[PDB]
Amino acid sequence: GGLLWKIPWRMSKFQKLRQRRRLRAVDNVVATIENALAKKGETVKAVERWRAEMPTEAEMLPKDKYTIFDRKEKRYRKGIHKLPKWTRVSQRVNPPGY
Amino acid sequence: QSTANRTKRMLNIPPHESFLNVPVEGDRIIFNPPSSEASVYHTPFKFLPRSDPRRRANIYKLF
């Protein structure tokens, strides 16, 4: 190609700090909504699905926070900053073994 | 820059370190001798009349 989209393949230590803090901020929203309902003895299907199949920032591996699964990459991994609107989208789980 | 507001930010100089130690609780009077030339209205203690009652110790010796 000729149109230059200068996107580095890896993130900087400053972007990683904000990715860590963005994952840790979505945990407080799900922990606030999950505890607010438990006091009322209530539950939601989407709040129970999240806690089941999604990990917290303290349970994620570094490669799951800064990378995603791309079948067209050599090692099936791609920088998470390559995902559209990656800053306002949730992406924590990748296919097993990849 | 484009706007006057953008120029004020590029030309900013922070206040002195002394003013940035704001008290969390209550009011405190602090000693902040400035790094500047004193005027002629700061009469030295040697030029004050014996009658004058304002001849205090150095402010260093009041802390």
Binding site: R22, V29, V30, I33, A36, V44, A46, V47, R88 | -
Partner: protein
């Protein structure tokens, strides 16, 4: 309790369905605070925009006049003395000094009613040729 939701991020590039979730919550612009009861209907509404908002449990809902009174800065001044002014719909309010406290507003169809010094008053002060200050005060 209630959910205190504040739109921290925008949705300029997110799908159209995400705008329908922020429209039902009432978040029009950025950093706008809304209060919604703690209920499953709202809780699933926040699981769709949980990457843009900040949720907080609060005991009571805040009114419109109370959400704005927590960001209102102190005036930093107090009017202690006012000078004579003419209020169009009320009348001519005289001078008042709030240090010794009296907004007396005299209205009428004659200059005497307004409470101001008229030409006749200046003729009575000009004919008092006997008034003299005491020698001790002079």
């Amino acid at each position: 309790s209630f959910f205190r939701i504040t739109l921290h991020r925008s949705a300029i590039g997110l799908p159209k369905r995400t705008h329908g979730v922020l429209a039902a919550l009432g978040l029009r612009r950025r950093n706008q605070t809304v209060f919604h009861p703690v209920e499953p209907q709202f809780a699933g509404m926040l699981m769709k925009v949980k990457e843009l908002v900040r949720v907080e449990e609060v005991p009571h809902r805040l009114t419109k006049r109370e959400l704005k009174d927590e960001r209102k800065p102190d005036a930093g001044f107090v009017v202690e003395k006012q000078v004579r002014r003419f209020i169009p719909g009320v009348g001519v309010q005289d001078e008042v000094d709030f240090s010794k406290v009296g907004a007396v507003v005299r209205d009428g169809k004659r200059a005497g009613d307004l409470g101001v010094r008229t030409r006749s008053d200046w003729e009575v002060i000009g004919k008092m040729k006997s008034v003299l200050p005491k020698v001790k005060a002079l």
